[PDB]
Symmetry: none
């Protein structure tokens, strides 16, 4: 298996993982992927990214 889905799941279908005000640090506290790019929906949710490569890259 290679690169697959991601933590960017359907905002409406995103399985909440905490509170709406959750943050990158707050969420991680539980262990989920953050995404406050959409209001009304929870920022802390469960992701779905599958791959065999490393678990760290770069995005600057």
């Amino acid at each position: 298996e290679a690169q697959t889905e991601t933590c960017t799941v359907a905002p409406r279908e995103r399985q909440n993982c905490g509170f709406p005000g959750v943050t990158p640090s707050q969420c991680a506290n539980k262990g989920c992927c953050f995404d406050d790019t959409v209001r009304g929906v929870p920022w802390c949710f469960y992701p779905n990214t599958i791959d065999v490569p490393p678990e760290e890259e770069c995005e600057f």
Copy 2:
């Protein structure tokens, strides 16, 4: 300290790892790449080792 195996290699230089008649499951069954897009050359071939030496950041 961060190497990775790719498949985007040159056929003429690609390291055969399984005849073309091979299937995606067969080729991968050994742990090699499978590209049935290029004819004439070996469809199933070993991956490639590549690194990413820094110099100022990580977007290089």
